[model samples]
Target chain A: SNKYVIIPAAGIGDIPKQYYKLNNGKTILDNTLVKFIDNPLFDKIFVAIFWNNSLYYNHDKIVVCNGGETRFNSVYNALNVIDERKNDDWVFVHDAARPCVSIDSIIDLYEQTKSSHSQAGILAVRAYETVKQVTKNIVVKTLARDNIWLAQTPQLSRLGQLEKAFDFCYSNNLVAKVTDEASALEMFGINPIVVECSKKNIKITTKDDLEYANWQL
Target chain B: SNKYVIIPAAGIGDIPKQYYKLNNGKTILDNTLVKFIDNPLFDKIFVAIFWNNSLYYNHDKIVVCNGGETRFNSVYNALNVIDERKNDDWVFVHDAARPCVSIDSIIDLYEQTKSSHSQAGILAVRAYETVKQVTKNIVVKTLARDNIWLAQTPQLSRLGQLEKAFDFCYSNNLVAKVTDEASALEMFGINPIVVECSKKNIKITTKDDLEYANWQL
Candidate 1:
């Protein structure tokens, strides 16, 4: 019945992108955590870092955990760290590199999921461009952009459902197929509702991504 | 072979998005035209407007043309307006609303196509996120993001080839199926080269897009 947030900050890169400083001088991870920390709905905010650092000294609500080799692995690692976690409780998993996730979206994800009586849901932007299905660099059929949604975060779901989904994927060797928490939840037949969010919520990866992030930030 | 630029400025909305002004007070269409104007590679820059204004005044290099019902039709209309277009001459078709398209990307599109001895090419950014294919709002398949490239402008091709492509598609009742110039040329068995471009180049549609463009601009 309670809510908790998980941020997987252990992505592989020359410079762990989550640690990269935006133009505002704050690390991407710091900016991402603040959005969840400021919200009163969450009981605890868990961050899965790559043996990173103790930047969350003053924040009483944060619980740091070790990140895994892969992103989903990090999510599972964070899930195991939470003590006395109940199945009925909720967990919202997000990416540390995505600092622009709006506060309205986080609130909407929780409210919409519960109101729709769905076990899981995630923030996504409707594909604005005409999406083309290509094979071997060849032009294929133009997909109907109407139904196509570009997945974003934070992906919210029942803690029990996410744990069960992760257990199934990890045990069945289907972990490789999981892209986001919604994908992981799908293996357990949990159809997550989609909440529309801003396109500014982009994951910082390359220098260009950081530059673009600077514009949005 | 000569090069010409085509800007499809006729998009549907209460106010045509092309007329929307950026933070710098330059209309999207004006800003887009200036990129081609400054480039010496192009002989003429053709704009397909929605029975739009004569904004091209005093720009000797520009030719105004009437846009068609659809984007492909607009491209076709603009192609026909070019006085002495040859099959071998190249044509770079870009969207009017995408004003943030860099000069570097525009130059690279032309240079790379000729240097590679390619008949066609386009500026595209690699898919940074894992793409999912869904049916009826269910998780269907996680697409390998490696080979996936999100299409962008300016889609460049030989003038004669594009003319021929439009000719074939229009005659064969395949106009509706075409998405971009490359898709039309694809029917002629032409595999256009993919020139990597910055993600800053975006088509302005919604107010959020305008806000983002203002940040980039």
Candidate 2:
């Protein structure tokens, strides 16, 4: 089965998070893209980018598409462009801010999603620390740490199945509640499997996260 | 008021996690203690250690106490020794594995606890990623990120208040349920305030965590 990679590097009203320069003087998106660009497992890498400097990636396999307003929208745009390809192809939607994602994790996500009955899966990490239910800066109760998982990216799905799931959400107005493609799949009544990934594959949201990501790389 | 530091470096049936050496060739406990030992803000630093090699710390203020089996028990033992001090003094219990905790966070936790109505507070960081309720390795729902906070270390309390909370939990058999000092405090009807701290302050549980901690330091 052919494998495709989709990266959503869109942002709202400011410099996209993917454009943030790392200590190595490369954009976070550049570092994120480097992993898949040279990899043989993926057939092509699609990026839904917001910025105009699309000239960075000159590779034939690296396809740049117009990004949407939100992350979901951006992924949706990528999925639309990828729709021209064979629907049987495997698509992995990954966050562009997560630069430390290793090929080992990518393989793990791919293998698990391939064999799963639903043909869909996403990368997640079990909550390591004590997760608490908090409201307005007060701890409510300590949740079962084993049962709690923090969702990460590289959500893999069959291209056709994901498009249908997106269509289901669009038709039913479930767009507002969907955080990830798995959320859309769940609403579409397909229980996507969870593939445990490395804890270091962190999504960079703040300056502190960039610092940690830099250190990890 | 006078301040005190308590570090519980106990483990079960093996070497305690605090003894794990970092890239700098110093133990995690040693790195954890360096911040508190040199800071004049703390009156004394107490550690509940399982091993007998207690000669690592050579300062008068660095007191070593015998550790118990679980974290709570180790903390209880430290509270027993600290009972000799004035009950009105401040106590900050921190994990020995968290070596990258900055003095700025310690000062923030201190200032927040000192100003709180309950005279107790804990260090935590807001969940940066999408937190989900998962069961049997499948995500169920996406939680409200703004309302969710992941608990961290250096739980501060008035010496008497925390000791009394521990006593109440012991009398009520809440020892098994208590994960942190704040959990005990919550059960004792004192809702400890939450103070946001740096994301770099992480507990070293796995080798990955140790790697990240080493990188951060």
Clashing pairs in 1: B87-B160
- What are the Cα lDDT values of the candidates? 0.76, 0.79
In terms of lDDT, model 1 sits at 0.76
* Residue-level lDDT tens digits of model 2 in B102-167: 888889889877887889888888775666666666666666444567778898999988889999
Highest lDDT against the true fold, candidate = 2
Interface RMSD of each: 3.4, 2.4
Q: Which segments of model 2 are wrong by more than 4 Å?
A: A10-14, A49-52, A85-87, A133-136, B10-13, B85-87, B133-142
Alpha-carbon deviation at A123 in model 1, angstroms: 1.1
Per-residue lDDT of model 1, residues A1-217, tens digit only: 7789998865442557666557667877788887778778889988876332545434788888888878888899999998999998999998887878888888887888877555788888766554554554444444433456777878889898789899999999987777788888777777788777888778776787687777775
Provide TM-scores for the models.
0.89, 0.87
Per-residue error (Å), model 2, residue A149:
2.8
Displacement of residue B164 (Cα, Å) in model 2 is 3.6
lDDT of 2 by residue, A42-99 (tens): 8889888634564467687888887887677888888888756777888888888887
DockQ of 1: 0.33
